[PDB]
Symmetry: C3
Subunit: 124 residues, 3 copies
């Protein structure tokens, strides 16, 4: 057989402080293939929501792809995307209070596993 | 410590037209380790089912590993497989009508992330 | 844009015999990023539980991160971890009987996909 496959893959870590606002976490090239986005909450928040989505490089085209309330504290996107003009992974925390129930800062870590647009030919 | 790990990993994209029949999407070498198969439905189908599975290179040994009705529109296989004599990822659409509710062709994209059988030795 | 990404990724296979006790399966470097741990049960066990978790290199700090009863036979960890002083993936089988309902040895395979701590700079 013969096929075209993506041979280069990167993983990007970003961390934000679980504070109200928006954050630009992962930079993505055009044609990249996102196969994993995992959001992790380190700490014990009491009230808030974290929504991760795709935002354009400059124009404010944010659109949440995964929502995450307080209780589950972790979440992976259920769908795989191909990058086209939406080259920023962004996070939004619309509700956020202080450290919360512990006196320690609640943080969030987003890990993005994506394959580069470069393609090679393999025969099996 | 010391261990043997897979150092080479590929991602394969395939696209089909959500039409009745079968399609051979991803070619796999013997000993490859499939760690991800994600199926995505781009469009608004109204009636149908897509079943992805493993088929032998020539003999008709199709066996569905993931079923996908219309409503969820996306699905990832829940199990990881090691390739042995079943070297084709294949898709079957047994029910399929026209574009559907939009006038635009409904398509499906299958992304397969698999590690090559080549192994190196790493000490930590 | 500009960002720092992990460019090196490994996959490790380990196999154990579904027998009562503990097993040290995957060796992990400090700063490595675990993005996948999948546990697979090959065979037909009748009674038992398999708990996978992180154990320190020498000191007995086992802590299960995923539990797996008999019936589902497969499971992936729901959270991503960064390695720090907990550099062993370990499995524990606290209940285990003979081959079980088939006369053939029940085995378990754990696949660990993790990115190396090495980081490069990419501009998009």
């Amino acid at each position: 057989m013969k096929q075209k496959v993506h041979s280069v893959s990167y993983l990007a870590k970003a961390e934000f402080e679980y504070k109200n606002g928006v954050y630009d976490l992962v930079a993505l090239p055009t044609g990249a293939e996102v196969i994993k986005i995992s959001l992790e909450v380190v700490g014990l928040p009491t009230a808030g929501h974290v929504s991760v989505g795709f935002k354009d490089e400059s124009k404010k085209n944010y659109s949440s792809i995964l929502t995450l309330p307080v209780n589950e504290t972790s979440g992976v996107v259920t769908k795989d995307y191909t990058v086209k003009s939406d080259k920023i992974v962004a996070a939004e925390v619309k509700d956020a209070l202080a450290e919360g129930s512990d006196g320690r800062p609640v943080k969030c870590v987003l890990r993005a596993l994506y394959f580069l647009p470069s393609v090679i030919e393999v025969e099996y």
